[PDB]
């Protein structure tokens, strides 16, 4: 928080951000997960201060991803909220799911197998269409032919005057996003998911940190 917030408070007394203009890539593992990380980098940042956001969910329809953060803001995902009529009970903690995620400003996404000149013409009228605090783009291994995308993703944080995010689906270290990309000369802060191995910057702080998980509500935990 310098800044329009990063992710965690021990991760906002670590590196410090998000600040003015940064290309980011959180090279996220298969098998383990990358779902709730989005439900804990851009879930509460829209629903508190008027530096609003947007969500790129490319390959899947944006609407299947809306069973992920409402079932993680209203803590209701075990009766269940992904298939129809609940038992006369789980209509309990609904007042926390959408009761904050509509008084902010977000554009969720699933527009075609995109190149990147979209978010250049789109972000010339979405900087002027939204409110802007972060710009959450899909993982760096689909948009096309993979390496070129990251190179022109550095400048994107420098146009709308807000830091821009684009994860990845390749241990995990900086030489596996390499067996499918370029990145190093471009993105100058590479976090991860096993463990958010933020092992890159000039600001100072870089550390070894994983967090606990619940997966009945998809919740992150810091201490």
* Shortest Cβ 71–another protein spacing (Å): 12
- CB nearer to another protein: give 8 or 107: 8
Check the annotation: does 36 bind a ligand: yes
CA 17 to CA 195: how far, in whole Å? 19
* Shortest Cβ 76–another protein spacing (Å): 9
Check the annotation: does 181 bind a ligand: yes
CA 83 to CA 80: how far, in whole Å? 7
**By three-state DSSP, how is residue 132 classified?**
coil
Check the annotation: does 200 bind a ligand: yes
221 lies in the binding site for another protein (CB under 8 A): yes
79 lies in the binding site for another protein (CB under 8 A): yes
155 lies in the binding site for another protein (CB under 8 A): no
Residue span 188-217 as binding mask against another protein, x where in contact by CB under 8 A, dash where not = ------------------------xxxxx-
Q: For residue 17, which of 191, 220, 184, 192 has the smallest C-alpha distance?
A: 191
* Shortest Cβ 177–another protein spacing (Å): 27
Tokens in use for 172?
Answer: 């995990």
- How many of the chain's residues bind another protein (CB under 8 A)? 11
| Active site positions, annotated | 59
- CB nearer to another protein: give 90 or 188: 90
- In terms of DSSP H, where are the helices of the chain? 35-38, 118-121, 147-151
* Shortest Cβ 40–another protein spacing (Å): 16
User: Which is it for the CA torsion 36, 39, 42, 48, positive or negative?
Assistant: negative
Question: What string of H, E and C letters represents the secondary structure of 154-212?
Answer: CHHHHCCCCCEEECECCCCCCCCCCCCCCCCCCCCCCCEECCCCCCCCCCCCCCCCCCE
Check the annotation: does 68 bind a ligand: yes
Answer for the pair 27, 177: CB distance below 8 angstroms, yes or no: yes
Instruction: Tell me how far apart the 2 most distant CA atoms of the chain are, in Å.
Output: 55
* Shortest Cβ 179–another protein spacing (Å): 28
Enumerate residues 7-36 that contact another protein by CB under 8 A.
Answer: none
Q: Report the residue from 13, 60, 61, 78 that binds another protein according to the rule CB under 8 A.
A: 78
Check the annotation: does 42 bind a ligand: no
Cis status of the peptide bond prior to 32, with omega within 30 of 0 = no
Q: Which residue numbers belong to the known binding site for ssDNA?
A: 178-179, 181
Which stretches of the chain bind another protein, using CB under 8 A?
Answer: 78-80, 89-90, 212-216, 221
């Amino acid at each position: 928080i310098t800044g329009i917030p990063t992710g965690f408070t021990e991760l906002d007394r670590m590196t410090s951000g998000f600040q003015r203009s940064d290309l980011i890539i959180v090279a996220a593992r298969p098998s383990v997960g990358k779902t709730a990380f989005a439900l804990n980098i851009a879930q509460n940042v829209a629903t508190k201060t008027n530096e609003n956001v947007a969500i790129f969910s490319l390959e899947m329809s944006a609407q299947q991803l809306v069973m992920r953060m409402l079932c993680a803001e209203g803590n209701i995902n075990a009766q269940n909220l992904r298939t129809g009529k609940l038992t006369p009970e789980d209509w309990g903690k609904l007042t926390m799911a959408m009761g904050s995620l509509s008084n902010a400003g977000i554009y969720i996404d699933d527009t075609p197998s995109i190149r990147v000149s979209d978010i250049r013409a789109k972000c010339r009228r979405l900087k002027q269409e939204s409110g802007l605090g972060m710009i959450v783009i899909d993982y760096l291994q689909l948009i096309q032919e993979v390496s070129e995308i990251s190179r022109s993703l550095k400048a994107l944080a420098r146009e709308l005057e807000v830091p821009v995010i684009a994860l990845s689906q390749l241990r995990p270290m900086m030489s596996d996003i390499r067996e499918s990309g370029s990145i190093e000369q471009d993105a100058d802060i590479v976090a991860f998911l096993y463990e958010i191995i933020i092992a890159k910057q000039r600001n100072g702080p870089v550390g070894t940190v994983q967090l606990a998980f619940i997966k009945e509500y998809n919740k992150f935990v810091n201490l």
